[PDB]
Amino acid sequence: MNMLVINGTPRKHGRTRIAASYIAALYHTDLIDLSEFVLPVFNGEAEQSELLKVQELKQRVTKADAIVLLSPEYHSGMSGALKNALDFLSSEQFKYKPVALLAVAGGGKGGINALNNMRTVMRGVYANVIPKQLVLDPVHIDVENATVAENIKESIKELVEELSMFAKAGN
Amino acid sequence: MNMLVINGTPRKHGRTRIAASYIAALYHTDLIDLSEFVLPVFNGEAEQSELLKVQELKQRVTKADAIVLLSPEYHSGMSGALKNALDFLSSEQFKYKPVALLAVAGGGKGGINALNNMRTVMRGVYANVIPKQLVLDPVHIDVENATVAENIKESIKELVEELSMFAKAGN
Numbered sequence A, B: 001m002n003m004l005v006i007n008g009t010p011r012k013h014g015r016t017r018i019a020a021s022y023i024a025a026l027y028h029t030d031l032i033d034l035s036e037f038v039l040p041v042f043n044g045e046a047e048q049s050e051l052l053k054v055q056e057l058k059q060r061v062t063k064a065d066a067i068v069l070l071s072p073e074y075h076s077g078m079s080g081a082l083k084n085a086l087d088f089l090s091s092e093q094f095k096y097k098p099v100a101l102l103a104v105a106g107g108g109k110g111g112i113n114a115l116n117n118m119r120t121v122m123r124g125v126y127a128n129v130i131p132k133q134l135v136l137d138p139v140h141i142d143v144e145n146a147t148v149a150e151n152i153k154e155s156i157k158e159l160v161e162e163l164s165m166f167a168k169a170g171n
Ligand SMILES: Cc1cc2nc3c(=O)[nH]c(=O)nc-3n(C[C@H](O)[C@H](O)[C@H](O)COP(=O)(O)O)c2cc1C
Pocket: A009, A010, A011, A013, A014, A015, A016, A017, A072, A073, A074, A075, A076, A077, A104, A105, A106, A107, A109, A110, A111, A138, B087, B088, B089, B124
């Protein structure tokens, strides 16, 4: 079970980091934190494909057999940071690969548009997004303790468990 | 009538540039071409808000009284380049401002997801997206002549005309 987790939040001090950091640790996964893994804004130039960064991304993303894609909802969407990232990839690295969506909003009814966005894009690169999805609000993140609240743990378990299921049935 | 046009395509050799470049010229508008206007991937740091670039963006975007937002559909979405841009802004600069969406796909049924994406995000910053929207395929862009095909001109006229209408009724 070679799993990958991508923290779409560019902000190093962002809650999504905490969530992503919790999941990766609890499941011993690869982890691409867009706070550290900084890429340049895509520009189509193939001399950009030869960039330090970029080759590793395709490499790690294609290595994984299942992915947990996290991102904060920014202006009812996924982060520009994560979209830019994805623009470098294609259905080459994602085709038929299991993906679990998870968004980090700021409360209220925020978070679904971030999810539909991701879901649509993922389907754009032909991935296999599992049904169960999840949105984590601030009440689900314990900043002071740099980890997630108890109330949401069971949900994350079920998410990762449905991912694993699909990712296995694959073969 | 102070209008602004934003070419969401990062690629300098991209078709969206041609379209955006045509519209801006035909209507004497401001123009932010994301091929030249390169920003860094957002990161939340306020020391990024003091970046050369960033201050001008908010400035020009808030100056405009109507905006024609163009972008190519990348992985069924708007470009990471343009989303990143928008992440720097907020409902501060967009509230109630008229926006016309226009996407540049590669043919087939591509282009609507790019539009819904933008439409949702725009609504996120409280803008006033006009009803009429438009998708331009390759058959609508005359690359060799660095301009748009005749078949699509009337459509662009109607688009910009509905924008102006709304942008005026505003007051
Ligand atoms: C530019 C910007 C736009 C945002 N837009 C939304 C939004 O549309 N809906 C929402 O629920 N939260 C929004 N947020 C709040 C984030 O979802 C919230 O910060 C969350 O804790 C994720 O934080 P992170 O991006 O630092 O990980 C936005 C935050 C920023 C900085």
